[PDB]
Amino acid sequence: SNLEKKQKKFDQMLAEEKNISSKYADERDRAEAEAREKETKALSLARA
Amino acid sequence: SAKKLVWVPSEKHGFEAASIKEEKGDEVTVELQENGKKVTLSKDDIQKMNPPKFSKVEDMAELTCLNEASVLHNLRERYFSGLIYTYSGLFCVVVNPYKQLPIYSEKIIDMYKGKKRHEMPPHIYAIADTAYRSMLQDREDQSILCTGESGAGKTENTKKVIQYLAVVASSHKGKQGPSFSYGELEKQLLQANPILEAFGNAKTVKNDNSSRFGKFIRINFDVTGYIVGANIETYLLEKSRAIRQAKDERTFHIFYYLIAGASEQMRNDLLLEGFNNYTFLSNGHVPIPAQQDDEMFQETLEAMRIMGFTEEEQTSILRVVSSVLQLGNIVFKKERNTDQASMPDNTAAQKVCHLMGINVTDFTRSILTPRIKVGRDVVQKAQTKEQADFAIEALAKAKFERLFRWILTRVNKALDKTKRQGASFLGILDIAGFEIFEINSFEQLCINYTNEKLQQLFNHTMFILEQEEYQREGIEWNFIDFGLDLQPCIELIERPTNPPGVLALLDEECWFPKATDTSFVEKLIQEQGNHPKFQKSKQLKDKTEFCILHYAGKVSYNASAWLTKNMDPLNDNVTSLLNQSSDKFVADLWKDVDRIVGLFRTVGQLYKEQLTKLMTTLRNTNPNFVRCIIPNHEKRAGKLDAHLVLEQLRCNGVLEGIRICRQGFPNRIVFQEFRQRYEILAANAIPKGFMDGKQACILMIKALELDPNLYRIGQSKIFFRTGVLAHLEEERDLKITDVIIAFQAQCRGYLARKAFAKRQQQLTAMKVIQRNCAAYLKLRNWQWWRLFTKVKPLLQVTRQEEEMQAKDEELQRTKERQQKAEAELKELEQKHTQLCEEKNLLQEKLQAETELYAEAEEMRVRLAAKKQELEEILHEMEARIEEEEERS
Amino acid sequence: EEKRRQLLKQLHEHETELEDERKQRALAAAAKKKLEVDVKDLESQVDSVNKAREEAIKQLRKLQAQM
Amino acid sequence: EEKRRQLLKQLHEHETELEDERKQRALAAAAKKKLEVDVKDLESQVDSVNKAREEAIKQLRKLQAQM
Numbered sequence A: 001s002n003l004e005k006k007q008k009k010f011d012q013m014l015a016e017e018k019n020i021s022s023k024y025a026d027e028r029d030r031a032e033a034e035a036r037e038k039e040t041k042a043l044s045l046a047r048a
Numbered sequence B: 001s002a003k004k005l006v007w008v009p010s011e012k013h014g015f016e017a018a019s020i021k022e023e024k025g026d027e028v029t030v031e032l033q034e035n036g037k038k039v040t041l042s043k044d045d046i047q048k049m050n051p052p053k054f055s056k057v058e059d060m061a062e063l064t065c066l067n068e069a070s071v072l073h074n075l076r077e078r079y080f081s082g083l084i085y086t087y088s089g090l091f092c093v094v095v096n097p098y099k100q101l102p103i104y105s106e107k108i109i110d111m112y113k114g115k116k117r118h119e120m121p122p123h124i125y126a127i128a129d130t131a132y133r134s135m136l137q138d139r140e141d142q143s144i145l146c147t148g149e150s151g152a153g154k155t156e157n158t159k160k161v162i163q164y165l166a167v168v169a170s171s172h173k174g175k176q177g178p179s180f181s182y183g184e185l186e187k188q189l190l191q192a193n194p195i196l197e198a199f200g201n202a203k204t205v206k207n208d209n210s211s212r213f214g215k216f217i218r219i220n221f222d223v224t225g226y227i228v229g230a231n232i233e234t235y236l237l238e239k240s241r242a243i244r245q246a247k248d249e250r251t252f253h254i255f256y257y258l259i260a261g262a263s264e265q266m267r268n269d270l271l272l273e274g275f276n277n278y279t280f281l282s283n284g285h286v287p288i289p290a291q292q293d294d295e296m297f298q299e300t301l302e303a304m305r306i307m308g309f310t311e312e313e314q315t316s317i318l319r320v321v322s323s324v325l326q327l328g329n330i331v332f333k334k335e336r337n338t339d340q341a342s343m344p345d346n347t348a349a350q351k352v353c354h355l356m357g358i359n360v361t362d363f364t365r366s367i368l369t370p371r372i373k374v375g376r377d378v379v380q381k382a383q384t385k386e387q388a389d390f391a392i393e394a395l396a397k398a399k400f401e402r403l404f405r406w407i408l409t410r411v412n413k414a415l416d417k418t419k420r421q422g423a424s425f426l427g428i429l430d431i432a433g434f435e436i437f438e439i440n441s442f443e444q445l446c447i448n449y450t451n452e453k454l455q456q457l458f459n460h461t462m463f464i465l466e467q468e469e470y471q472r473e474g475i476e477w478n479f480i481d482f483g484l485d486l487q488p489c490i491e492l493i494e495r496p497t498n499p500p501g502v503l504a505l506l507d508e509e510c511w512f513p514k515a516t517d518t519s520f521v522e523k524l525i526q527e528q529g530n531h532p533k534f535q536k537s538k539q540l541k542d543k544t545e546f547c548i549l550h551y552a553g554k555v556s557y558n559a560s561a562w563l564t565k566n567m568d569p570l571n572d573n574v575t576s577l578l579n580q581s582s583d584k585f586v587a588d589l590w591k592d593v594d595r596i597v598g599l600f601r602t603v604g605q606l607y608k609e610q611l612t613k614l615m616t617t618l619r620n621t622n623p624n625f626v627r628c629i630i631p632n633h634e635k636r637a638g639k640l641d642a643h644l645v646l647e648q649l650r651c652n653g654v655l656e657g658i659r660i661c662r663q664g665f666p667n668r669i670v671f672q673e674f675r676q677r678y679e680i681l682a683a684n685a686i687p688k689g690f691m692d693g694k695q696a697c698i699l700m701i702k703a704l705e706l707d708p709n710l711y712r713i714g715q716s717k718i719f720f721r722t723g724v725l726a727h728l729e730e731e732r733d734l735k736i737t738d739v740i741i742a743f744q745a746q747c748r749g750y751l752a753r754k755a756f757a758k759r760q761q762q763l764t765a766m767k768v769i770q771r772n773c774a775a776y777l778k779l780r781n782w783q784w785w786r787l788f789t790k791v792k793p794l795l796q797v798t799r800q801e802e803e804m805q806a807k808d809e810e811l812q813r814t815k816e817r818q819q820k821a822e823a824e825l826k827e828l829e830q831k832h833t834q835l836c837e838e839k840n841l842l843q844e845k846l847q848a849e850t851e852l853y854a855e856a857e858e859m860r861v862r863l864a865a866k867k868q869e870l871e872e873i874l875h876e877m878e879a880r881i882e883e884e885e886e887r888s
Numbered sequence C, D: 001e002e003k004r005r006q007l008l009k010q011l012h013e014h015e016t017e018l019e020d021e022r023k024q025r026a027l028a029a030a031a032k033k034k035l036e037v038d039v040k041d042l043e044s045q046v047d048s049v050n051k052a053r054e055e056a057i058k059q060l061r062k063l064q065a066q067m
């Protein structure tokens, strides 16, 4: 019974883990874009 | 795996591993794996092997197949490993190692406290903590119960439990290691054990530290769950042995500790000598391993000092204990011309009466030829050598009982500073174990009886209570009885109804002055004859021997002088003298004399009274058992007798108990509680509208998709199999932990902000302090300050108006207090005169009723005499009428 | 808080002392009912014994008259 | 002051309520003792009645044997 409940749970959890992984990839790319933006800002401040 | 492998019985090891070759009818041919020896057993004899994965496995409830031999082997391997603890479902079993191990520390205590059994290895700390947590959560009373034979180790478990309690239950004063400064009551509690042990324990063939007494501790808690008080109850002790010592056995440890440890100054004060100088000390000095008598003497006295004893109330105990030791030296010799006792060694009596502060002349004659009041007359008692011996030994018993009573009351009164309020309590029961030797008198029987009666109580609570609960809730279950029952043996001894048991017969034949111990045993044999648990004399009828059946084996008893134990006879003249002793301490010990007996209450009935009370407490509280097992009778570490542990395990009924634990449903909860505790798991499925909560519970149980064999639904309680609720609770809490951490960060943030804000006020205060102190410190070496200091008190501050105003203000307060004191005085005066008049009226009325009673009772006696007279005359008339009728 | 502790201790002690008196009331009532049953039983015994006595006297007088 | 008033009121009310229970204990004990005396009296009646019955039977048998 426990194994069957787990089997059902693993299927759901793998799909949700893919969603979470995708969310982290999006936030990673957002943080990378932020890093580029603030790097540009730092260069502008240095030139100023 | 090789399915032909089996446990086969062994004369040396109880059971041992072997391999089946073939089978024939009801039998199997097998080869022992240790030597290759062939043998044939019955198919009922051999048992199935414990697989490798289950070797040394923890809880007995987890075993793939319940086998006595597998349990035995797991126990032996664990004893060789030194892991003494093993779980058995709801309870725990242990085994005496006879050797100290580092299984106990503050680090371990902190590691165990508040954790669940499933996440931890076994320990007594876990049992103590579980009882504490359940006590706190349910707000009911709880108890811990250690059980086993005389050598089995209980006192080590008890020592660990009260130590654990004395740290976990402590309230924090707001002020880390084992030298931590505990609270005052915990400090007393941790000293009470060594105090009581010194006065109450002795060496026996079974145990070098054998407790001669039964005890019960309890600790009381507030609504917050912290300790606020404690009590120490103690039951009747094996006091007889102390001056009638069997070979290689010892008296109470305090005697040896005093005789060895006393300074020359102390020795002269107490009029003491070294060993072998005392008639009451058979075998002379008897040694004991591991102890250091002088050092023990120091530490027990220091323990009494920590318990807040004065030096006088220590030395007074030493005086009385010296007195019982010395009085044995009052040797008697009988005058053949008169059969009366005489005392050639009157020096001993002079020493004793000096230590007691009474008259030597009266002390001598009240022992040798006393004058005793018998009703109306006061008459010279003829007194033999044996009667004089009996009198002084009985006096020693009386002195000892009074001193032990004083000790027990004094130690409780230390705790009795605390208030009468409390929420609930946790108990600790520690009764002396099963015990036997070359003589079996009444003094051992009561202890052995309570040991087996406790096992019978366990039978009820473990087996019967379950069937009753399941039947009450009406669930799908089937009754079973494995036949664990001691009741006929209890009924043989006790008298709740007829026919009369051992105790009742002993009391009845004790009361009758014409009867003796032979009369008692004869009546027992006649009236109990062929009772399933009784057995007659082993041909030695002249020895007045008889026997009774117990689960620990049949025991033969010796009835000699049981009547004096029930009657408790004591000398009235010496009692009167001691009651009026010159020593205030002795006068206090002997203040009560209403149990004087020159021939009241039966010791059996007294014992029953305390027993029913404690047993009712055991029925009301929730007990936690911790069973301890004897490895061998030679008091040796590492060595283990398979047959001893086997038969102890069997009679404890653990193989039967664990079966019903796994087969039944140990967890149980009311439906409303089940829903309110776990609803989060099915909140979308459970309807909001009001209904029978069991429907919501069914919906939740279905959502969890539980197997219907794992639970049973009653009308009120839902029963569940082991631990499921505690794992669901863990999962539910884990679901909440994420938001809890976020809230915790906010609360800790608030706390940090508060602390920082306070620190700012402290910083600004400190800055102005520093300005002031630096300014003064720089300048105070200037000379002018001395002149300023001379001049200022002549000029500044008028003072006297402020002083006058202050005096006037305080005068008003003092006048107010006076008015209140006078009002209270008047109230007390009004109540005083009322109580005085009521006292007067009651005294007058009492005197009237006493006179009326006297008048009634004297005439009652007169009428009884006339009744007897008329009855005798009527007998004479009946004789006469017969003589007439025969003549006619 | 000290006033609370004192008054609560007083309340607790006074309550438990009189609760023991209430237990004594329960015991007294039980004993009363037991003795009431004993009185009824003994009254039935007196009824039967007196009837038997009177019947014995009747038979005695009858036989005495027949002799 | 309000805590004092409340706790004192509670103490007073609970004390008088349980004092009424103590009076009920006194009444119950009085009734118990009364019924105990009645039991002893009735036991004495049974003693006398039974003795009289047995004596009547003895005399009956004696006279029956004499006839």
Ligand SMILES: Nc1ncnc2c1ncn2[C@@H]1O[C@H](COP(=O)(O)OP(=O)(O)O)[C@@H](O)[C@H]1O
Pocket: B084, B095, B096, B097, B098, B099, B100, B101, B148, B149, B150, B151, B152, B153, B154, B155, B156, B157, B207, B209, B210, B211, B433
């Ligand atoms: N848990 C334990 N750890 C260490 N030694 C133990 C332990 N339990 C028992 N012992 C040993 O067993 C001896 C006797 O056990 P004891 O507690 O006196 O048993 P009982 O109270 O049943 O007579 C002790 O002196 C000690 O050496």
Ligand SMILES: [Mg+2]
Pocket: B150, B153, B154, B155, B209, B210, B211
């Ligand atoms: Mg012990």
